[PDB]
Amino acid sequence: KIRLYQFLLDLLRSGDMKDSIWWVDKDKGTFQFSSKHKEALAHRWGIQKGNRKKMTYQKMARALRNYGKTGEVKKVKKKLTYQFSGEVLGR
DNA sequence: AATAAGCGAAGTGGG
DNA sequence: TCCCACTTCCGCTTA
Ligand code: NA
Pick out residues whose CB falls under 7 Å from strand C: A 3-5, 45-46, 49, 51-53, 55, 58-60, 62-63, 66
Q: Are the beta carbons of A46 and A2 closer than 8 angstroms?
A: no
Indicate the resolution in Å: 1.5
> What are phi and psi for residue A62, nearest 5 degrees?
-65, -40
List Cα–Cα distances, A24 to A8, A32, A51, A52, in angstroms.
14, 6, 30, 33
A24 Cβ contact list (under 8 Å, min separation 6): A30, A31, A32, A78, A81
Q: How many CB atoms neighbour CB A82 within 10 A?
A: 23
Q: Are A64 and A88 in contact (CB under 8 A)?
A: no
Q: Report the distance from CA of residue A53 to the C1' of nucleotide B3 in Å, as an integer.
A: 24
- Residue A44, Cβ neighbours under 10 Å: how many? 16
**Cα of A75 to ligand 1 centre, how many Å?**
14
**Which of helix, strand or coil describes residue A62?**
helix
